[PDB]
Amino acid sequence: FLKPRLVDIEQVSSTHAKVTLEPLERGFGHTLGNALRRILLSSMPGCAVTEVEIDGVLHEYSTKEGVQEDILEILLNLKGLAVRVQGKDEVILTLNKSGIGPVTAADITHDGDVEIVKPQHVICHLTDENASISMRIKVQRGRGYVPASTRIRPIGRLLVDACYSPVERIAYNVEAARVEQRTDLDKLVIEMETNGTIDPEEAIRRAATILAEQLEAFV
Amino acid sequence: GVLKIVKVYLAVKRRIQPGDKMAGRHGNKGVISKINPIEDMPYDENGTPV
Amino acid sequence: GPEEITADIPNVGEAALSKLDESGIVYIGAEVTGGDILVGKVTPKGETQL
Amino acid sequence: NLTKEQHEWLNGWLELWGAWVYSGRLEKRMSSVIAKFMESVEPGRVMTRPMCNDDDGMLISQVVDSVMYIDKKAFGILLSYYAHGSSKHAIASYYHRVARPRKMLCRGGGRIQKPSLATCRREVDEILNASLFMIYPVLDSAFKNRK
RNA sequence: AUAAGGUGGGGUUAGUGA
């Protein structure tokens, strides 16, 4: 038998890309197709938002003078906020912004180990000439979908749900390979969809790492 | 005969759970049966889940 | 006699007492569960007023 | 044997305990009028024995089970004393009625009788005097262990 | 175990295809 290898990662855009696996025998395109699709949607390490403590706010179901938006819409906007962390397993981010205008992703106090990926992602609009927000955004690692109720203290600490999944949409396509003097061999092409927080070769390598650990369990 | 009344507003968030009634606009009722993970959905060649 | 509203109570633990104010009322935004105490109300049984 | 302060402090915890467990009595009586008959009168004898929270009563329940699980007689008279609140002499009577002529051989001679009610008092008393002394350093650490 | 609890009225839910 043969073994496939990486020939290309077509970085087609900032968000997503396509990789290529080649060569393969019969069924293994479909086998690793359904397999690696299912693993990539299954479980990758995530870097979601965890909880947010905005300053003058008792609780999520109230307002704040100086912003057009409710609190609720704000933190659901933060639920989609993507970010990249390297050296830690949890970190606390901080934003301070006054003046009339939209609140972008740029206004956080960035560090060298954390890295936002989409600077344009809006949060809210300040409408007052002199009002500000000052929240502290706790961010940690994780894996999977974790609601806020299934976990486990001061009242300013609001909560969110956890969506520890960098991936969005996985598609794979088999076709024949163009091998030297041989047929019946297969080019696997995989299209992933990433928010921007995970490099592809790392992703599939982690996936097959998990899959080897799972075939490990009996032989 | 009462001295003071204290009203308390309590606020609940409710998501969804297997056993809820949810329906379209054609008399097509339904009780939601199984919240089944993403990977088991049908999906097109483009890759989008239903 | 009347009835009182304060945080003075006979014989419950400090767990429910943690989440009241000085007047016996939960703060706005303290998340509670079932069986928690919102307002400590007591009766003076045995008040004299003589 | 234990000391006087220990007897006080532990004694207060135990009366709160048996007061608490006595509230888990199976059934009482009352009526449908008596409460209305009750709120507008001053009763007199407040039979409401005070008890601890559920945390302490559960905890020291685990303590009393944890030592006293080995003798069910001593446990039973313990619940007699604090749970029902009955006196030592009263259970000297209850116990003396059915102590069972078990042919205990005295310094008088071979005898077929109950040990006397004069006997059964100091029978009872040496039990719980040792029993509190047994359970005391366990419980005194147990509040400290939560602490 | 201190949440208990009668009488009217109103609104809603579930009950075939030959």
PDB file of all heavy atoms in Angstrom, chain C residues 12-35:
ATOM      1  N   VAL C  12     -31.251  30.388  60.550  1.00  0.00           N
ATOM      2  CA  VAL C  12     -30.782  29.870  59.275  1.00  0.00           C
ATOM      3  C   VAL C  12     -29.322  30.241  59.154  1.00  0.00           C
ATOM      4  O   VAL C  12     -28.816  31.116  59.857  1.00  0.00           O
ATOM      5  CB  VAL C  12     -31.549  30.377  58.039  1.00  0.00           C
ATOM      6  CG1 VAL C  12     -32.987  29.918  58.059  1.00  0.00           C
ATOM      7  CG2 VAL C  12     -31.450  31.867  57.930  1.00  0.00           C
ATOM      8  N   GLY C  13     -28.655  29.567  58.233  1.00  0.00           N
ATOM      9  CA  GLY C  13     -27.238  29.767  58.061  1.00  0.00           C
ATOM     10  C   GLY C  13     -26.916  31.087  57.393  1.00  0.00           C
ATOM     11  O   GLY C  13     -27.785  31.842  56.963  1.00  0.00           O
ATOM     12  N   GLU C  14     -25.618  31.348  57.288  1.00  0.00           N
ATOM     13  CA  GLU C  14     -25.162  32.600  56.716  1.00  0.00           C
ATOM     14  C   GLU C  14     -25.179  32.580  55.199  1.00  0.00           C
ATOM     15  O   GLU C  14     -24.866  33.602  54.580  1.00  0.00           O
ATOM     16  CB  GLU C  14     -23.767  32.890  57.243  1.00  0.00           C
ATOM     17  CG  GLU C  14     -23.761  32.823  58.742  1.00  0.00           C
ATOM     18  CD  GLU C  14     -24.675  33.852  59.359  1.00  0.00           C
ATOM     19  OE1 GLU C  14     -24.686  35.008  58.885  1.00  0.00           O
ATOM     20  OE2 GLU C  14     -25.429  33.490  60.286  1.00  0.00           O
ATOM     21  N   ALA C  15     -25.521  31.438  54.598  1.00  0.00           N
ATOM     22  CA  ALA C  15     -25.569  31.335  53.149  1.00  0.00           C
ATOM     23  C   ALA C  15     -26.629  32.246  52.557  1.00  0.00           C
ATOM     24  O   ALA C  15     -26.320  33.057  51.679  1.00  0.00           O
ATOM     25  CB  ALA C  15     -25.829  29.891  52.742  1.00  0.00           C
ATOM     26  N   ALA C  16     -27.866  32.158  53.043  1.00  0.00           N
ATOM     27  CA  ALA C  16     -28.889  33.073  52.558  1.00  0.00           C
ATOM     28  C   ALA C  16     -28.644  34.482  53.064  1.00  0.00           C
ATOM     29  O   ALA C  16     -29.006  35.456  52.396  1.00  0.00           O
ATOM     30  CB  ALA C  16     -30.274  32.592  52.974  1.00  0.00           C
ATOM     31  N   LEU C  17     -27.993  34.607  54.213  1.00  0.00           N
ATOM     32  CA  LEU C  17     -27.710  35.914  54.772  1.00  0.00           C
ATOM     33  C   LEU C  17     -26.658  36.662  53.978  1.00  0.00           C
ATOM     34  O   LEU C  17     -26.556  37.887  54.095  1.00  0.00           O
ATOM     35  CB  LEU C  17     -27.254  35.757  56.212  1.00  0.00           C
ATOM     36  CG  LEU C  17     -28.381  35.115  57.000  1.00  0.00           C
ATOM     37  CD1 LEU C  17     -27.919  34.810  58.390  1.00  0.00           C
ATOM     38  CD2 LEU C  17     -29.595  36.022  57.019  1.00  0.00           C
ATOM     39  N   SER C  18     -25.871  35.943  53.182  1.00  0.00           N
ATOM     40  CA  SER C  18     -24.853  36.577  52.362  1.00  0.00           C
ATOM     41  C   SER C  18     -25.466  37.466  51.297  1.00  0.00           C
ATOM     42  O   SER C  18     -24.871  38.476  50.917  1.00  0.00           O
ATOM     43  CB  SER C  18     -23.995  35.510  51.701  1.00  0.00           C
ATOM     44  OG  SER C  18     -24.783  34.768  50.791  1.00  0.00           O
ATOM     45  N   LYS C  19     -26.649  37.122  50.822  1.00  0.00           N
ATOM     46  CA  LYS C  19     -27.181  37.778  49.648  1.00  0.00           C
ATOM     47  C   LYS C  19     -28.285  38.765  49.957  1.00  0.00           C
ATOM     48  O   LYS C  19     -29.044  39.110  49.053  1.00  0.00           O
ATOM     49  CB  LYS C  19     -27.656  36.721  48.665  1.00  0.00           C
ATOM     50  CG  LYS C  19     -26.503  35.885  48.173  1.00  0.00           C
ATOM     51  CD  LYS C  19     -26.975  34.753  47.312  1.00  0.00           C
ATOM     52  CE  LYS C  19     -27.479  35.282  45.999  1.00  0.00           C
ATOM     53  NZ  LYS C  19     -26.380  35.849  45.188  1.00  0.00           N
ATOM     54  N   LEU C  20     -28.404  39.228  51.188  1.00  0.00           N
ATOM     55  CA  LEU C  20     -29.320  40.311  51.489  1.00  0.00           C
ATOM     56  C   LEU C  20     -28.551  41.591  51.711  1.00  0.00           C
ATOM     57  O   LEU C  20     -27.332  41.592  51.867  1.00  0.00           O
ATOM     58  CB  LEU C  20     -30.149  40.016  52.727  1.00  0.00           C
ATOM     59  CG  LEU C  20     -31.127  38.877  52.613  1.00  0.00           C
ATOM     60  CD1 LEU C  20     -31.885  38.795  53.907  1.00  0.00           C
ATOM     61  CD2 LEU C  20     -32.037  39.144  51.469  1.00  0.00           C
ATOM     62  N   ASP C  21     -29.282  42.687  51.784  1.00  0.00           N
ATOM     63  CA  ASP C  21     -28.669  43.946  52.161  1.00  0.00           C
ATOM     64  C   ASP C  21     -28.683  44.067  53.683  1.00  0.00           C
ATOM     65  O   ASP C  21     -28.942  43.097  54.397  1.00  0.00           O
ATOM     66  CB  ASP C  21     -29.376  45.118  51.479  1.00  0.00           C
ATOM     67  CG  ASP C  21     -30.836  45.248  51.877  1.00  0.00           C
ATOM     68  OD1 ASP C  21     -31.400  44.352  52.532  1.00  0.00           O
ATOM     69  OD2 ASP C  21     -31.432  46.283  51.539  1.00  0.00           O
ATOM     70  N   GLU C  22     -28.436  45.269  54.187  1.00  0.00           N
ATOM     71  CA  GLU C  22     -28.594  45.513  55.608  1.00  0.00           C
ATOM     72  C   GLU C  22     -30.051  45.611  56.010  1.00  0.00           C
ATOM     73  O   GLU C  22     -30.360  45.536  57.202  1.00  0.00           O
ATOM     74  CB  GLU C  22     -27.876  46.795  55.982  1.00  0.00           C
ATOM     75  CG  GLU C  22     -28.465  47.993  55.303  1.00  0.00           C
ATOM     76  CD  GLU C  22     -27.673  49.242  55.562  1.00  0.00           C
ATOM     77  OE1 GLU C  22     -26.658  49.160  56.283  1.00  0.00           O
ATOM     78  OE2 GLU C  22     -28.058  50.305  55.037  1.00  0.00           O
ATOM     79  N   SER C  23     -30.949  45.778  55.054  1.00  0.00           N
ATOM     80  CA  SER C  23     -32.358  45.909  55.346  1.00  0.00           C
ATOM     81  C   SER C  23     -33.112  44.602  55.194  1.00  0.00           C
ATOM     82  O   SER C  23     -34.303  44.550  55.504  1.00  0.00           O
ATOM     83  CB  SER C  23     -32.970  46.959  54.438  1.00  0.00           C
ATOM     84  OG  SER C  23     -34.345  47.110  54.725  1.00  0.00           O
ATOM     85  N   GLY C  24     -32.455  43.556  54.709  1.00  0.00           N
ATOM     86  CA  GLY C  24     -33.104  42.277  54.520  1.00  0.00           C
ATOM     87  C   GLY C  24     -33.597  42.014  53.119  1.00  0.00           C
ATOM     88  O   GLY C  24     -34.489  41.179  52.937  1.00  0.00           O
ATOM     89  N   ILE C  25     -33.052  42.696  52.124  1.00  0.00           N
ATOM     90  CA  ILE C  25     -33.541  42.635  50.756  1.00  0.00           C
ATOM     91  C   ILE C  25     -32.362  42.286  49.871  1.00  0.00           C
ATOM     92  O   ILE C  25     -31.253  42.782  50.088  1.00  0.00           O
ATOM     93  CB  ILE C  25     -34.194  43.964  50.331  1.00  0.00           C
ATOM     94  CG1 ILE C  25     -35.509  44.167  51.075  1.00  0.00           C
ATOM     95  CG2 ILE C  25     -34.468  44.022  48.859  1.00  0.00           C
ATOM     96  CD1 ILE C  25     -35.407  44.985  52.337  1.00  0.00           C
ATOM     97  N   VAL C  26     -32.587  41.376  48.928  1.00  0.00           N
ATOM     98  CA  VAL C  26     -31.564  40.999  47.973  1.00  0.00           C
ATOM     99  C   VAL C  26     -31.154  42.211  47.153  1.00  0.00           C
ATOM    100  O   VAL C  26     -31.955  43.121  46.905  1.00  0.00           O
ATOM    101  CB  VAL C  26     -32.101  39.847  47.108  1.00  0.00           C
ATOM    102  CG1 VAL C  26     -33.320  40.273  46.353  1.00  0.00           C
ATOM    103  CG2 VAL C  26     -31.062  39.313  46.171  1.00  0.00           C
ATOM    104  N   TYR C  27     -29.872  42.286  46.825  1.00  0.00           N
ATOM    105  CA  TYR C  27     -29.415  43.338  45.946  1.00  0.00           C
ATOM    106  C   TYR C  27     -29.958  43.112  44.548  1.00  0.00           C
ATOM    107  O   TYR C  27     -30.349  42.006  44.177  1.00  0.00           O
ATOM    108  CB  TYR C  27     -27.900  43.366  45.893  1.00  0.00           C
ATOM    109  CG  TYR C  27     -27.292  43.634  47.219  1.00  0.00           C
ATOM    110  CD1 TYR C  27     -26.777  42.608  47.976  1.00  0.00           C
ATOM    111  CD2 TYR C  27     -27.243  44.916  47.722  1.00  0.00           C
ATOM    112  CE1 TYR C  27     -26.216  42.853  49.197  1.00  0.00           C
ATOM    113  CE2 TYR C  27     -26.690  45.173  48.946  1.00  0.00           C
ATOM    114  CZ  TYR C  27     -26.175  44.136  49.677  1.00  0.00           C
ATOM    115  OH  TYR C  27     -25.622  44.385  50.904  1.00  0.00           O
ATOM    116  N   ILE C  28     -29.972  44.179  43.762  1.00  0.00           N
ATOM    117  CA  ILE C  28     -30.354  44.063  42.364  1.00  0.00           C
ATOM    118  C   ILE C  28     -29.236  43.335  41.641  1.00  0.00           C
ATOM    119  O   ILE C  28     -28.097  43.798  41.617  1.00  0.00           O
ATOM    120  CB  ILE C  28     -30.612  45.429  41.737  1.00  0.00           C
ATOM    121  CG1 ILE C  28     -31.844  46.048  42.362  1.00  0.00           C
ATOM    122  CG2 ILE C  28     -30.779  45.292  40.250  1.00  0.00           C
ATOM    123  CD1 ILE C  28     -32.020  47.483  42.000  1.00  0.00           C
ATOM    124  N   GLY C  29     -29.553  42.191  41.067  1.00  0.00           N
ATOM    125  CA  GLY C  29     -28.609  41.475  40.244  1.00  0.00           C
ATOM    126  C   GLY C  29     -27.987  40.283  40.907  1.00  0.00           C
ATOM    127  O   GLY C  29     -27.202  39.580  40.260  1.00  0.00           O
ATOM    128  N   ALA C  30     -28.281  40.012  42.162  1.00  0.00           N
ATOM    129  CA  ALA C  30     -27.760  38.807  42.775  1.00  0.00           C
ATOM    130  C   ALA C  30     -28.518  37.618  42.217  1.00  0.00           C
ATOM    131  O   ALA C  30     -29.737  37.524  42.372  1.00  0.00           O
ATOM    132  CB  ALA C  30     -27.889  38.868  44.289  1.00  0.00           C
ATOM    133  N   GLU C  31     -27.807  36.730  41.543  1.00  0.00           N
ATOM    134  CA  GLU C  31     -28.428  35.563  40.940  1.00  0.00           C
ATOM    135  C   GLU C  31     -28.780  34.590  42.051  1.00  0.00           C
ATOM    136  O   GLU C  31     -27.944  34.286  42.902  1.00  0.00           O
ATOM    137  CB  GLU C  31     -27.484  34.946  39.916  1.00  0.00           C
ATOM    138  CG  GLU C  31     -28.120  33.929  39.009  1.00  0.00           C
ATOM    139  CD  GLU C  31     -28.118  32.556  39.611  1.00  0.00           C
ATOM    140  OE1 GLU C  31     -27.228  32.289  40.439  1.00  0.00           O
ATOM    141  OE2 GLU C  31     -29.006  31.750  39.270  1.00  0.00           O
ATOM    142  N   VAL C  32     -30.019  34.118  42.067  1.00  0.00           N
ATOM    143  CA  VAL C  32     -30.469  33.207  43.103  1.00  0.00           C
ATOM    144  C   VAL C  32     -31.017  31.944  42.476  1.00  0.00           C
ATOM    145  O   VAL C  32     -31.309  31.876  41.281  1.00  0.00           O
ATOM    146  CB  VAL C  32     -31.533  33.829  44.002  1.00  0.00           C
ATOM    147  CG1 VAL C  32     -30.964  34.990  44.743  1.00  0.00           C
ATOM    148  CG2 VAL C  32     -32.684  34.251  43.154  1.00  0.00           C
ATOM    149  N   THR C  33     -31.181  30.936  43.317  1.00  0.00           N
ATOM    150  CA  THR C  33     -31.729  29.648  42.947  1.00  0.00           C
ATOM    151  C   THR C  33     -33.021  29.419  43.715  1.00  0.00           C
ATOM    152  O   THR C  33     -33.466  30.270  44.486  1.00  0.00           O
ATOM    153  CB  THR C  33     -30.726  28.547  43.257  1.00  0.00           C
ATOM    154  OG1 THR C  33     -30.521  28.497  44.671  1.00  0.00           O
ATOM    155  CG2 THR C  33     -29.406  28.836  42.589  1.00  0.00           C
ATOM    156  N   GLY C  34     -33.614  28.244  43.528  1.00  0.00           N
ATOM    157  CA  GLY C  34     -34.827  27.914  44.241  1.00  0.00           C
ATOM    158  C   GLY C  34     -34.571  27.696  45.716  1.00  0.00           C
ATOM    159  O   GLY C  34     -33.524  27.202  46.125  1.00  0.00           O
ATOM    160  N   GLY C  35     -35.538  28.110  46.527  1.00  0.00           N
ATOM    161  CA  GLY C  35     -35.436  27.970  47.959  1.00  0.00           C
ATOM    162  C   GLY C  35     -34.646  29.054  48.648  1.00  0.00           C
ATOM    163  O   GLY C  35     -34.556  29.043  49.879  1.00  0.00           O
TER     164      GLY C  35
END
